[PDB]
Design a protein around this ligand. Structure first.
Ligand SMILES: Nc1ncnc2c1ncn2[C@@H]1O[C@H](COP(=O)(O)CP(=O)(O)OP(=O)(O)O)[C@@H](O)[C@H]1O
Ligand SMILES: [Mg+2]
Ligand SMILES: [Mg+2]
Length: 347
RNA sequence: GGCUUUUGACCUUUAUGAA
RNA sequence: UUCAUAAAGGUCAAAAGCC
């Protein structure tokens, strides 16, 4: 049964039946992650005469957040290398480490330990930001898709709960404003992005799944011309924080609220102070700049240079058209045909 | 009320890499 | 000691499906 035909009272059942991970899926992925992690820690750089060390492999993305879609969520890994020493460095040397990681993976395949399938993407253009591939192992019951990124460890050993030293963002902003980049180093702060969602209430994670599924369904019609998926994820968090703040709430009202916020994209200016704030003048000046951009502005809680909004109003136009149609579906409607109603946003 | 799953919190333990 | 990935054991909670 398609989401498109599911009424409001069955959305939680729909999430349960199609979207939530089952035991096998999340078990096989964690096995696949283990294979790649061991490889990176025990093999991949053991050949370098000048030792390249991996300080940590961070499981990011939906996998680290607990918002994965069953049988559809990739594994996102950020591998932190001791020899990348700064944002400048990561930006210039990321290409090398990718290629090298590719070679060693090949040399493992050649050995019959597992099988990897990459996908050439042309034109190559700017250095690659990631290495993507599919993994297959006699060990595993299924294949898992991967996304691997090398990164400079800006945070050091970071403990969830603490705001990162502002001087780290001072430095971030300095390089970004000099090289004309914005949001290019969000991977270094993956752990903050993971922390922003990991501890949220269970049903909120479930709604995020639903919104993600709706968004993927939209992509069938619009390909890659939509705003970034992360924008919608953050938009869902914003909806809950201003309209509920409760562990229990109606999924349909949540769904409707999000769809309505999409239609109001020309008024969206959303940001958080979970990891930075206006205290430090430099960080403060950069936040303020971002909030003066054309709407919608959705500021990455982990990255003050990062407007997840995407800066492309055609994308939001397209997404808004779909939001208009989906508001006529049984998804947000009661039994009598009336809409369940959206939450109302605190200041 | 009963059965179970998913997602987190806290306290232990094992392997691997790193500071 | 701490950080990361996987596994194991104990305890607590949230939400969901089913009866
Ligand atoms: N536009 C963006 N700006 C900043 N960070 C982003 C971003 N897009 C993605 N990210 C970060 O990189 C992670 C991996 O992205 P994706 O794999 O593309 C989606 P996901 O969040 O993993 O869910 P999904 O893979 O289950 O669909 C995201 O969770 C987010 O933390
Ligand atoms: Mg992902
Ligand atoms: Mg990914």
């Amino acid at each position: 049964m398609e989401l498109r035909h599911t009424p409001a009272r069955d959305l939680d059942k729909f999430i349960e039946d199609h979207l939530l991970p089952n035991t096998c899926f999340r078990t096989q992925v964690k096995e696949a992650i283990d294979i790649v992690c061991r490889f990176l820690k025990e093999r991949c750089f053991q050949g370098t005469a000048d030792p390249v060390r991996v300080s940590k492999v961070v499981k990011g993305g939906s996998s680290g957040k607990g918002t994965t879609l069953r049988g559809r969520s990739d594994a996102d890994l950020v591998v932190f290398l001791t020899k990348l020493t700064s944002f400048e460095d990561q930006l210039r040397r990321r290409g090398e480490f990718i290629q090298e990681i590719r070679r060693q993976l090949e040399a493992c395949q050649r050995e019959q330990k597992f099988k990897v399938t990459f996908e050439v993407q042309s034109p190559r253009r700017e250095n690659p930001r990631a290495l993507s591939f599919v993994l297959s192992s006699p060990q595993l019951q299924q294949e898992v898709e991967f996304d691997v990124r090398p990164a400079f460890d800006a945070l050091g050993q970071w403990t969830p709960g603490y705001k990162p030293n502002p001087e780290i963002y001072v430095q971030l902003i300095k390089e970004c404003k000099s090289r004309g980049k914005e949001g290019e180093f969000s991977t270094c702060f993956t752990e903050l992005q993971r922390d922003f969602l990991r501890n949220r209430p269970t049903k909120l994670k479930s709604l995020i799944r639903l919104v993600k599924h709706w968004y993927q369904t939209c992509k069938k019609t619009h390909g890659n011309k939509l705003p970034p998926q992360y924008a919608l994820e953050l938009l869902t968090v914003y909806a809950w924080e201003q309209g509920s703040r409760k562990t229990d709430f109606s999924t349909a009202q949540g769904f409707q609220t999000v769809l309505e916020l999409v239609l109001k994209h020309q008024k969206l200016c959303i940001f958080w102070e979970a990891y930075y704030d206006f205290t430090n003048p430099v960080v403060g000046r950069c936040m303020l700049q971002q909030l003066k951009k054309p709407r919608p502005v959705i500021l990455d809680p982990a990255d003050p240079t990062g407007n997840v909004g995407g800066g492309d109003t055609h994308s939001w136009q397209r997404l808004a058209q779909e939001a208009r149609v989906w508001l006529g579906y049984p998804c947000c409607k009661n039994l009598d045909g009336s809409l369940v109603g959206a939450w109302t946003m605190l200041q």
